[PDB]
Amino acid sequence: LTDLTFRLLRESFADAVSWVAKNLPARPAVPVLSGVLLTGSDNGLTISGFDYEVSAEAQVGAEIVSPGSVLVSGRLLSDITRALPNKPVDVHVEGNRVALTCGNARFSLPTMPVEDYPTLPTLPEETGLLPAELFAEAISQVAIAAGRDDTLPMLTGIRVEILGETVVLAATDRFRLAVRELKWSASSPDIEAAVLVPAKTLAEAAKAGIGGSDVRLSLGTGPGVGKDGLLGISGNGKRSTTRLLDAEFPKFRQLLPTEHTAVATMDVAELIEAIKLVALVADRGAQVRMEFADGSVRLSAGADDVGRAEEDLVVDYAGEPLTIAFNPTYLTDGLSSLRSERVSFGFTTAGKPALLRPVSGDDRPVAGLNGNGPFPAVSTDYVYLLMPVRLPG
């Protein structure tokens, strides 16, 4: 009925467009799906994109001179708003072109047709709320373990388990398993469900609440959780929806040990640096070896043909000496995911998984730690379970 004309500061405009671009980084085959939709009414501007799998929308205050909507190239609008100086941006739709003016610069972009542009999905009912930073961090942590190979679709997702008081997030690529448990404010106390969500850009979607206290997870309420086949994530004028994966996740809980025959605690920053150093002589970046004993661990890599490397690091160790080897990338991935100063390793044999957990202040000590063991596992809200690789012998 009327043509859209609005006006707002560049930083706000750019940040809204950025939200959509970060949540939809790839370029779909269907051209119209590359469009961003601008809608102005009353005192607000909504900026959105959709590709049938992920939708993303930001809402910002704006001076709406004339209400309406327009579809324009997402790529161009992103490039332009990122490059502009911090001045007011005028946008005026006229015919099948949109005029975008900022200071002395004038752009005139072709409009795209909304005839076959899909309607954005509706957010399901709120399922619960989490602290904004905590959730964004939790997703970032576990996502490092997700598979990235579509030939095994079940591994490309982050498992999300809802249980009234808690949310559990899990991801695995068959070589590491990351599991995070968070407490939250659930709308329904008796709720129980589990879904599988594509991991590839879930870390970006997880930042929706940043700027505010909480982020809202929307999967539906009561019995019909997961029914819509979408996960909504929103907060602070930003939202997204992500189509769920209809694939079965491995049963991972049986893998989490409840006791260890050896336990080692050490400094994360030191260990990461030493791994990166000794791995410089590892061929194919295949393997680093760790010889744990009382008071110290020898980290080593290499062979007599290209070169050998080793470094001794202080460790607070319990049990019998153990030699165990790891993929150094998987190992530093785990260490970096801990987001803590110190790491505790829980071991059994050189051929069985190693359990990495962050060391906290409120951790209750392992009783009989100085004795023989087996040593009971310490309660933790994050674990990174890592398979070792076989030693050459």
């Binding site: 695995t172 398993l177 491995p250 049963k251 991972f252 993929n327 051929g351």
Partner: peptide, 10 residues
């Protein structure tokens, strides 16, 4: 390079 003993999965 063994996998985690996921069942199924390995």
């Amino acid at each position: 390079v063994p996998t985690l003993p996921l069942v199924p999965x390995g």
